[PDB]
Design a protein around this ligand. Structure first.
Ligand SMILES: COc1cc(-c2cncc(-c3ccc(CN4CCCC4)cc3)c2C)cc(OC)c1OC
Length: 296
């Protein structure tokens, strides 16, 4: 097993989900995710998706290996992937501002990744439709070429037209509350319809677009990095803080006036508002977003 050969060097992420370490393996950095004992269904789901489906795409965090090892006198579940030293989009947006080309590169490569997940590919070399269910800026990494890749398939849902079998797994984990779509927060989401989960992804992608656009300079200014709904919920908002803001008060992120004086940001403002329709079926698709961003 690889697990015992990897040298863990420093912790680069920690939460209720577990930890991620920068590790050394075969003379290279690798990312090692060590799952909390409470989150093993996530490791199960990610391993399934990376080893059984062979998910591989330039805008999807690149799988290396999945492993069971016992360190420190207990058995841990490890996921090992490429390590992106630029870190998460969430951190990246805090340490730098963006020009037009860099902003569009970022958001388009996210669209590319999410389209690839959402769309079914038939044949000997293919994949079922996949919905992410926890898309956020901390689950997006920034590559050295300035594109991004989507990470954390632990909540993935799958569907194939071959079988008409919706596969939601058995994970008790739920999405990051700050990013939950209205229909999740008010528990009217249609849980047996695969499209529902794609539309939850599109809502969260809209929020990520907002986070990114704020950091694009126009007429010499930018907004500070903030997370969606920073102004109306505390850190680590409860399910009820979000339900009140998003469902009862029907809040959406505010568009800064200066965006309408720049054409790219105007275009992006139009997109993100069409990810935020309360009616889930009215929201844009990943492929549509991808197509529009390509033209901008
Ligand atoms: C193994 O599994 C996963 C690894 C990663 C992952 C991959 N590459 C790099 C990183 C990272 C490296 C360094 C920093 C620190 N910053 C500060 C300033 C610059 C760098 C942040 C993040 C991480 C977390 C992410 C996952 O999900 C979110 C994983 O779970 C699927």
């Amino acid at each position: 097993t690889v697990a015992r050969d990897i040298t863990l060097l420093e912790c680069v992420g920690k939460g209720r989900y577990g930890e991620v370490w920068r590790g050394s393996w075969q003379g290279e950095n690798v990312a090692v995710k060590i799952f909390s004992s409470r989150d093993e269904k996530s490791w199960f789901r990610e391993t399934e998706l990376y080893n059984t489906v062979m998910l591989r795409h330039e805008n999807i965090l690149g799988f290396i290996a999945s492993d069971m090892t016992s360190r420190h006198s207990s058995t841990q579940l490890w996921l090992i992937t490429h390590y992106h030293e630029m870190g998460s989009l969430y951190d990246y947006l805090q340490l730098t501002t963006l020009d037009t080309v860099s902003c569009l590169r970022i958001v388009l490569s996210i669209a590319s990744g999410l389209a690839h997940l959402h769309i079914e590919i038939f044949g000997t070399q293919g994949k079922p439709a996949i919905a992410h269910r926890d898309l956020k800026s901390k689950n997006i990494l920034v590559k050295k070429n300035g594109q991004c890749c989507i990470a954390d398939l632990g909540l993935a849902v799958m569907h194939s037209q071959s079988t008409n079998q919706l596969d939601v797994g058995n994970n008790p984990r739920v999405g990051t509350k700050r990013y939950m779509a209205p229909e999740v927060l008010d528990e009217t989401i249609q849980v047996d319809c695969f499209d529902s989960y794609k539309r939850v992804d599109i809502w969260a992608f809209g929020l990520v677009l907002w986070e990114v656009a704020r950091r694009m300079v126009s007429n010499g200014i930018v907004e500070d990095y903030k997370p969606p709904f920073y102004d109306v919920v505390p850190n680590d908002p409860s399910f009820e803080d979000m339900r009140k803001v998003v469902c009862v008060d029907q809040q959406r992120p505010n568009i800064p006036n200066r965006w309408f004086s720049d054409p790219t940001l105007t275009s992006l403002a139009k997109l993100m508002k069409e990810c935020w329709y309360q009616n889930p079926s009215a929201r844009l698709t990943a492929l549509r977003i991808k197509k529009t961003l390509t033209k901008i």
